[PDB]
Amino acid sequence: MEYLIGIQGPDYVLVASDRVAASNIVQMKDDHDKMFKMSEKILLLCVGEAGDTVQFAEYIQKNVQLYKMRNGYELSPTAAANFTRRNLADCLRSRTPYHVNLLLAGYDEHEGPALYYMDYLAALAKAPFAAHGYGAFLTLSILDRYYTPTISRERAVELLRKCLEELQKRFILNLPTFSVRIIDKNGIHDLDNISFP
Amino acid sequence: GYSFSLTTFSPSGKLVQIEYALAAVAGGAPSVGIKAANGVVLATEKKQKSILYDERSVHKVEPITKHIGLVYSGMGPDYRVLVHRARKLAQQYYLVYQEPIPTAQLVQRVASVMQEYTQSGGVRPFGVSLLICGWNEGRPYLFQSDPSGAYFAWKATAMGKNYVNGKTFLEKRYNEDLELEDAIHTAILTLKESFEGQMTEDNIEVGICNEAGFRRLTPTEVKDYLAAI
Amino acid sequence: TGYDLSASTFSPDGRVFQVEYAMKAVENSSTAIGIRCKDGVVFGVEKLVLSKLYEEGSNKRLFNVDRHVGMAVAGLLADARSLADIAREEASNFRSNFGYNIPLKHLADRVAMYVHAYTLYSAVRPFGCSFMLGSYSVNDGAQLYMIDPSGVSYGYWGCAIGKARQAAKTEIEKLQMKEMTCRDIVKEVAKIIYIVHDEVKDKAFELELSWVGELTNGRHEIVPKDIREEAEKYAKESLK
Amino acid sequence: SRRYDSRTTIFSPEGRLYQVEYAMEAIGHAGTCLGILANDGVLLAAERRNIHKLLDEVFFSEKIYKLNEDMACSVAGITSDANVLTNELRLIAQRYLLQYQEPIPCEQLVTALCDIKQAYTQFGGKRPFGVSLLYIGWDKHYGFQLYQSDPSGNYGGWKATCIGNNSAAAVSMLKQDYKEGEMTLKSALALAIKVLNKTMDLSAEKVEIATLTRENGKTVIRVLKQKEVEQLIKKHEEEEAKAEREKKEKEQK
Amino acid sequence: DRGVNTFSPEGRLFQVEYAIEAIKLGSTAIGIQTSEGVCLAVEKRITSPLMEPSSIEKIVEIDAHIGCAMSGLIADAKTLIDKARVETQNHWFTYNETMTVESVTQAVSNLALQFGEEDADPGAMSRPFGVALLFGGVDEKGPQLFHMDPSGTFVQCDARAIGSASEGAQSSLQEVYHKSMTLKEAIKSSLIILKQVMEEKLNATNIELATVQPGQNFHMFTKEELEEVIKD
Amino acid sequence: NQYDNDVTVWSPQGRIHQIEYAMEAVKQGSATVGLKSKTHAVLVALKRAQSELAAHQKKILHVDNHIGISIAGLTADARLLCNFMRQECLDSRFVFDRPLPVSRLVSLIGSKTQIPTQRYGRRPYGVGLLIAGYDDMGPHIFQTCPSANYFDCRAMSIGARSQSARTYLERHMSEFMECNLNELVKHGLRALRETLPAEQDLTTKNVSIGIVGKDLEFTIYDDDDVSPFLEGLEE
Amino acid sequence: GSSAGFDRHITIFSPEGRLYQVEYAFKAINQGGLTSVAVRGKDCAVIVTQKKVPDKLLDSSTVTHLFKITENIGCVMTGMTADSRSQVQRARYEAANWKYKYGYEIPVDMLCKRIADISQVYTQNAEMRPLGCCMILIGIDEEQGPQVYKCDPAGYYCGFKATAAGVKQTESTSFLEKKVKKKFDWTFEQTVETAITCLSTVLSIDFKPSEIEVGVVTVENPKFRILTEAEIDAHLVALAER
Amino acid sequence: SYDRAITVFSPDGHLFQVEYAQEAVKKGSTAVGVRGRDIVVLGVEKAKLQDERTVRKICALDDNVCMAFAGLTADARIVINRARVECQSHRLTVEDPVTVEYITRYIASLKQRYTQSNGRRPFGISALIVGFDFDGTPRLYQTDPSGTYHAWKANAIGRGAKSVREFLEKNYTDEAIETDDLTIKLVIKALLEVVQSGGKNIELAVMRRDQSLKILNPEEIEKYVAEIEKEKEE
Numbered sequence A: 001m002e003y004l005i006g007i008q009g010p011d012y013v014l015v016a017s018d019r020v021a022a023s024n025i026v027q028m029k030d031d032h033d034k035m036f037k038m039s040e041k042i043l044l045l046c047v048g049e050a051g052d053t054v055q056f057a058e059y060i061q062k063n064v065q066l067y068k069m070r071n072g073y074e075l076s077p078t079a080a081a082n083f084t085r086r087n088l089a090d091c092l093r094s095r096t097p098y099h100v101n102l103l104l105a106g107y108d109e110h111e112g113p114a115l116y117y118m119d120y121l122a123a124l125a126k127a128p129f130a131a132h133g134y135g136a137f138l139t140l141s142i143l144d145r146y147y148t149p150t151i152s153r154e155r156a157v158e159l160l161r162k163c164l165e166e167l168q169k170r171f172i173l174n175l176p177t178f179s180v181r182i183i184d185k186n187g188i189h190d191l192d193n194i195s196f197p
Numbered sequence B: 001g002y003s004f005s006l007t008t009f010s011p012s013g014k015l016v017q018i019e020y021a022l023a024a025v026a027g028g029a030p031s032v033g034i035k036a037a038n039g040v041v042l043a044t045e046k047k048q049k050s051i052l053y054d055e056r057s058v059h060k061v062e063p064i065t066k067h068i069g070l071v072y073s074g075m076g077p078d079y080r081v082l083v084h085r086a087r088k089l090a091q092q093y094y095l096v097y098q099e100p101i102p103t104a105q106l107v108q109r110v111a112s113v114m115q116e117y118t119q120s121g122g123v124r125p126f127g128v129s130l131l132i133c134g135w136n137e138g139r140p141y142l143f144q145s146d147p148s149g150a151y152f153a154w155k156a157t158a159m160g161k162n163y164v165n166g167k168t169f170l171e172k173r174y175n176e177d178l179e180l181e182d183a184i185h186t187a188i189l190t191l192k193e194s195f196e197g198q199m200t201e202d203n204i205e206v207g208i209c210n211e212a213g214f215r216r217l218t219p220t221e222v223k224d225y226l227a228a229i
Numbered sequence C: 001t002g003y004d005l006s007a008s009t010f011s012p013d014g015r016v017f018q019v020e021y022a023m024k025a026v027e028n029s030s031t032a033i034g035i036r037c038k039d040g041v042v043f044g045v046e047k048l049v050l051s052k053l054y055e056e057g058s059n060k061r062l063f064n065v066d067r068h069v070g071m072a073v074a075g076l077l078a079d080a081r082s083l084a085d086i087a088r089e090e091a092s093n094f095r096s097n098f099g100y101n102i103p104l105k106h107l108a109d110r111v112a113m114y115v116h117a118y119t120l121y122s123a124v125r126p127f128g129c130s131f132m133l134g135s136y137s138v139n140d141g142a143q144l145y146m147i148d149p150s151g152v153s154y155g156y157w158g159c160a161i162g163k164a165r166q167a168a169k170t171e172i173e174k175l176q177m178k179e180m181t182c183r184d185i186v187k188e189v190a191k192i193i194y195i196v197h198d199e200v201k202d203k204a205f206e207l208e209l210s211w212v213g214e215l216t217n218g219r220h221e222i223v224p225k226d227i228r229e230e231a232e233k234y235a236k237e238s239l240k
Numbered sequence D: 001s002r003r004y005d006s007r008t009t010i011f012s013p014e015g016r017l018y019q020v021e022y023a024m025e026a027i028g029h030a031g032t033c034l035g036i037l038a039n040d041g042v043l044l045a046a047e048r049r050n051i052h053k054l055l056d057e058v059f060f061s062e063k064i065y066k067l068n069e070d071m072a073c074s075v076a077g078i079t080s081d082a083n084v085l086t087n088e089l090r091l092i093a094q095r096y097l098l099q100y101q102e103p104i105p106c107e108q109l110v111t112a113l114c115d116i117k118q119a120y121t122q123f124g125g126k127r128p129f130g131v132s133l134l135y136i137g138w139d140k141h142y143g144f145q146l147y148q149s150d151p152s153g154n155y156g157g158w159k160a161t162c163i164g165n166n167s168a169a170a171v172s173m174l175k176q177d178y179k180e181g182e183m184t185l186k187s188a189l190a191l192a193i194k195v196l197n198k199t200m201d202l203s204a205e206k207v208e209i210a211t212l213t214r215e216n217g218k219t220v221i222r223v224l225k226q227k228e229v230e231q232l233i234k235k236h237e238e239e240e241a242k243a244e245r246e247k248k249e250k251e252q253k
Numbered sequence E: 001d002r003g004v005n006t007f008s009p010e011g012r013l014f015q016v017e018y019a020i021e022a023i024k025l026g027s028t029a030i031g032i033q034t035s036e037g038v039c040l041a042v043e044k045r046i047t048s049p050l051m052e053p054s055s056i057e058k059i060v061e062i063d064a065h066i067g068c069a070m071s072g073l074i075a076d077a078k079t080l081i082d083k084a085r086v087e088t089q090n091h092w093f094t095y096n097e098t099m100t101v102e103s104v105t106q107a108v109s110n111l112a113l114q115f116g117e118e119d120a121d122p123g124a125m126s127r128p129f130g131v132a133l134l135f136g137g138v139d140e141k142g143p144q145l146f147h148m149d150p151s152g153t154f155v156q157c158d159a160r161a162i163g164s165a166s167e168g169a170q171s172s173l174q175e176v177y178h179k180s181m182t183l184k185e186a187i188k189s190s191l192i193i194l195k196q197v198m199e200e201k202l203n204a205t206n207i208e209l210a211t212v213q214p215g216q217n218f219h220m221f222t223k224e225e226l227e228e229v230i231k232d
Numbered sequence F: 001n002q003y004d005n006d007v008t009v010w011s012p013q014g015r016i017h018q019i020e021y022a023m024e025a026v027k028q029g030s031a032t033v034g035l036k037s038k039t040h041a042v043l044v045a046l047k048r049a050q051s052e053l054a055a056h057q058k059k060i061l062h063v064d065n066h067i068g069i070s071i072a073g074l075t076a077d078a079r080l081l082c083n084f085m086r087q088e089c090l091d092s093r094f095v096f097d098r099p100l101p102v103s104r105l106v107s108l109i110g111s112k113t114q115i116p117t118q119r120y121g122r123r124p125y126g127v128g129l130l131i132a133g134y135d136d137m138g139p140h141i142f143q144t145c146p147s148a149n150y151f152d153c154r155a156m157s158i159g160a161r162s163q164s165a166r167t168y169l170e171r172h173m174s175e176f177m178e179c180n181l182n183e184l185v186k187h188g189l190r191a192l193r194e195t196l197p198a199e200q201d202l203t204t205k206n207v208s209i210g211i212v213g214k215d216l217e218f219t220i221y222d223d224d225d226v227s228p229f230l231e232g233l234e235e
Numbered sequence G: 001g002s003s004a005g006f007d008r009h010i011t012i013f014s015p016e017g018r019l020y021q022v023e024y025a026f027k028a029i030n031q032g033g034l035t036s037v038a039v040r041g042k043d044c045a046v047i048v049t050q051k052k053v054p055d056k057l058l059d060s061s062t063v064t065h066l067f068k069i070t071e072n073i074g075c076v077m078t079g080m081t082a083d084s085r086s087q088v089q090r091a092r093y094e095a096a097n098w099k100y101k102y103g104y105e106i107p108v109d110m111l112c113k114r115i116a117d118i119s120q121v122y123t124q125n126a127e128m129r130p131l132g133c134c135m136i137l138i139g140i141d142e143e144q145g146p147q148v149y150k151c152d153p154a155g156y157y158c159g160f161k162a163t164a165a166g167v168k169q170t171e172s173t174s175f176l177e178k179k180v181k182k183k184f185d186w187t188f189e190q191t192v193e194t195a196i197t198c199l200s201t202v203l204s205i206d207f208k209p210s211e212i213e214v215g216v217v218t219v220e221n222p223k224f225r226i227l228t229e230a231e232i233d234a235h236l237v238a239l240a241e242r
Numbered sequence H: 001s002y003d004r005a006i007t008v009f010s011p012d013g014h015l016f017q018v019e020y021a022q023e024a025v026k027k028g029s030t031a032v033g034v035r036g037r038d039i040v041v042l043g044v045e046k047a048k049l050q051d052e053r054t055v056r057k058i059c060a061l062d063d064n065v066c067m068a069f070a071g072l073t074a075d076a077r078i079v080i081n082r083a084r085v086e087c088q089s090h091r092l093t094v095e096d097p098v099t100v101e102y103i104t105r106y107i108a109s110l111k112q113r114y115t116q117s118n119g120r121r122p123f124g125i126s127a128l129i130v131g132f133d134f135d136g137t138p139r140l141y142q143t144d145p146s147g148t149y150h151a152w153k154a155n156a157i158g159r160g161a162k163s164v165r166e167f168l169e170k171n172y173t174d175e176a177i178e179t180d181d182l183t184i185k186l187v188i189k190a191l192l193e194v195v196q197s198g199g200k201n202i203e204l205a206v207m208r209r210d211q212s213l214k215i216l217n218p219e220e221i222e223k224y225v226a227e228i229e230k231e232k233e234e
């Protein structure tokens, strides 16, 4: 019902998410942000059940910030993705399972750019591109068709726009605006939102 | 319970309660261990205060599992605690890995229990040193585990009364290529250095460990070895 | 001294001094007696009155531990009452488990083992109390047991605890109680208490009498005022 | 019971923790243990106290413990206390790897065990662990590293340090010949043999050396063979003999 | 070395006796109850000019109608102050009303002999609080002043002095206290007695003053207000 | 001296010095008197003021509509024991819908206060009580002590110089059962007065009165409410 | 006889490696003033101990040191009375619990080993004292015949041909080791009589049926049996004819 | 569980265990804190064979708060990690970041608890906590083993805290605060009263309003030491 998308290029990770906060038949917020900064070079995009998403994302964020304070360096995107997986998997068979679907996008000095997909069951996959929500059923084939591993950030935003246009055209849910950010060797960069009249 | 340690460091950096536990071992009846090329021998002085003692009721040389055996010097009642715990630990290893516990693994697990009793609240250390034998990698093993929780792999060693002299006799009479039968003869000879009186098959106890596992020698087998002297 | 501060410490000669000191508190206390006869058990207590301001019956030293069991104490009274509660709860537990009245030897064994448990550790102190348990059943007869601070429990024909324990004992030995009834034994109990009481040293006192036997239907109860007054008048007249 | 209570975690009037200080006294009696950090590796050289004709060699080493794929350590003190701590160091390292799917950065493994030692000096009423540890390792943050920890739960990183018997004498001897940034594993091995020769009384069977190097993106931890130790020891005798010639002949001319 | 719950041959717990002695080392505080309000005044005892005097809090607000003056080990008082504040808010939540000055004093007093070693929770109190408190506020019974010591004994006072020079300040309060005195006269007498017993010369930074009046909430005096009162 | 610091340690004389030291706490506190007639149980107390500027410490506490107490000893221990009594009384009305028999409440105090006298690191309650009550057995005056022992009393006095009060009560105890409430309170006040030196007398500042009876729920009289009782005699 | 710190007050090693508190527990056994003897025969095992009833005021039937642990296991206790009843109670529990978990009557050696193991804990943990008592158990083993086992306040335990406990333990064991060295049949009568005559010669007392108590187990009747004054008198009068 | 009362009152009204913990602080390296106008400075007194990084006594608790300590360094590490966890736990429960006073209050209550709970001895450290609240006000606070805390304009803890405090009392002027470079020199000037050589034995870190903690390298410290000698002769 909410949309997340990530496209990993040779030296960057492009991510986008819808900006709707909804309750029942009403769009309560048109400028809502579903991205969470973990480190200077890591974003956690989170989607799912109403309480779970912010509770889970914030807990991981503060523990990632605690690691930075205790050791003087930040966790790598891989270590952060695995730490997120460990918490989600530990809650799975517990009294409190979190119904969250997420994407972790990061940049590491040594490993380069990375995109991780995680579902509410805590399965973790490294992907060149990925999407979450009903929107992924309409946009995954667009990325299969046009994505190449050497895709430039300029071309990646065009591809992202192609995906977001398909939702406007065929998806029954409103979703008019999208948050867009890109991560590289210089950290997290805010791009202009994708908007439709 | 008392939640504070009873063993503490003295100003000279000593754990005086472990040193006093070692004095209990030093006062105990002699014990010998000899790792032969094809097996291990454990021999001990099982001398009793009277004829009225039923010799075959209690044992000093004890099996832990099918391939591991034990002997000791020091406190008899403390020893039984360690035998029960060692037998238990060997069964836990077997349930998990479905393979008989390597001698070094059993020694390490029993040494940990012994170390606990030097730091845990309201307890004194064990006044026992163990001599553990075994057969596992197609090769024999002999270990000593003392009251502090420290262990040592030995080719041959002595513990208890007159142990410093037993170790010198072993030093000159030990060869890495000795066979199990010859090592039993040598083990009884080390005990005879400090034995006060006449040595019969009822006042000494011998245990062996080879490819066929660990077992105690019957008094008839001990009699045949004593015939050779 | 040194070896006498904890019940978890033996002295070099194999003694537990904290238990012996708890027994001294019993010896320093007033005298209580118990006598087993042909048809029951009779209790008598020399209850010294510390103040004329107290009510008659205050600081009772005779208790109903079960409907068929009575308890007579000597020593530290708060410890004694605590032991009466342990005995009550123990007797109640037996009835819940088996559906009938706890046999007195069993009740004594059970209570004595709580007492014993307080003689092994530094965490707790031994009870400063010695007590007797009396009962009467048709299948069991008359039964009198006595437990001391160490945890020892024995069966008795005659028994005395406190200040004049040995003085009351030589007076009890003069009775052939095996062929006597509760009704005649009450007079004897009051008499022995009046003999051992030290008028000079312990000014005034109240005689406490209890009994459980064939007469009471195996129920432990107070000896009625009239029989108590007859035994009390008899005790005073024999003293002359 | 207050009569029998040793009071192990209390302060002395000078703000001192006596059980910790008494544990440090024990460490002085244990075998000499040193660590030297070089540009291409890091090493541990330790005096062997289990030297006896009738001892059997069943383990790879006596005082060297592999902790993880990129780390190893050496101890000085109560060897049963060292077995407790080394086992815990392995559990901490496996717990970090299970959580982040990356090996525990060297300093983090040290601080983790040190917090346990520290707890033993503040509460619990228990005696402290009578062990001092030397840690050698490699990580993607600081590369080759050397650490030292005490019964107090106190630690520090070092270029070269010593624990155990004649520690101060060995440290000052290291202080003279250690050249910062210009040490190779070859020169550090010769310094380890030089320092041990003086702080002991020197057969290869009374010493134990281990090196930590990087080979093809993988960490290599190896305890040197008895022959290899004889070669380093022999070269040291051939340097002391050459040194005696550059004193008797360099005074006449 | 005896335990913390050992009685002396005189019938007092040693640890409580010594906690009373610890208050004889705290800075002196005075409280005066008057039909027009209660005033609380205390000496800050500033050790260095580099220390921020605004960060020495010896008079605190428990609730709008209740204030607290403290003396002794000030870190120990911080726990009792917060427990008092929590009790007022728990009472407000449940009963929809303010607590009486006496009920708040009693609530804090219930924690007094809650120390010990054997039969206790993992991190329970090992010793008493080395604090003396002066609660001052207004309720349906009018202005009231209450005293409390480490033993937990709490009592109502018309005038009370606690701390190092409590013996001398109580003498001065006894000779100057009149039941029908005004709030202005009580404030001045407090400042006079404090100037007398204080080592340093009293100024608007060295001391703390507060009033709780019927009709006025708890008020901490500002530097400008303290200087205007110092004049007389 | 070595048998001095623990309740678990018996001295060689069969004495527990820690219990005997706790008993002293009662003797240090001000005197209180408790006495009874056929219809009323009365408690009278001397309230101690720390200074002329301080109020006189509350000596009389309410437990239930049918029970009230007078304290002597550590006030925090008195508050703890009073709260225990109040709860035990509340449970009895919740479960049985009937007031707790006074003698049964006193037994609970004896069991409760004995526990710490037999366990290491624990201490006796340093407080003594005088308990006024009224139930199916009429009025009562009970006495509880740090030793965990308890007494059923005709009348009683505890605290500093309380032997003086006991001498008066021992003489007039023949009159007590037939006294009317004013005659009974007067007797209690005269016994309380005996403890006081010859200089000072009973005022409406240092006198506290507690009354329970056949027609009266436990009521506490303290300042102006004390005046009707203090008009009966002049030394 | 070296001492350091609290080694005479609690169960911690002395500088020589002794446990003074355990040594003191052996001295506590003799405090009772009694002596016990247990003798094993060809087809039986008998226990005998002094029955000192000095007061007619006691109910002599409640004054005993012989206890039934199970139907086929009986014991004689020497030492501190309450400690001994506590140990008997524990033995009874351990025996009943063994049958519940394993489905067979506990062997005498196993019950003795278990009591000895429980006793060893008191020897190693400081908060409690060892029991100042000694347990001697008897019973017929299905495969091993009659058994006599003894356990210590030290935690030691052993099987015996004949044994003793109490004040005259050393004197009774010297008597028994002389009697066992001579070739005897060891019938029931010989075993009962050797036990009675060991105690009599050692205490220098000609016994009366009320001055001793005897407990027995046989291959024919393995149930623990306590002898009556009449049955004990039969043995005493048979011993008089020699 | 070990339930012995470690810190108890002595006959005179003293808490000896807490006073003994203050003796351990007195033996620690001198730590100095100075609160300037747009900057806060921490300086700590100082083996060639030692890695300096592994033994720094100036730690960051959060982006806006940092601290220095004097006393038992292992104890300090425990206090520091608890303060660090608390800063994140504060952001998680209330969203907004911690104030210098909030985290000082947390550290002080932790220290006080260890002076009144069974089985524990007090922490043998004193702390100088500096930073900027969200509103931008610079802060300096000091905690000690007892659990007391106060705000300061400037302060010193550890070895020779008395003589360095007296120096700061005379040299803390509005002219000495005027520039960010002048306040840094004040910490150096004060540290030179106890540190015999200076520069080589000084660890110094600064925190500017919206800037994160900045550790000054030895060459930077040598520059400010050289500037002091110019002022000294002129």
Ligand code: NA
Pocket (backbone or CB within 6 Å): G010, G011, G121, G122, G123, G124, G125, G126, G127, G128, G129, G130
């Ligand atoms: Na013990």
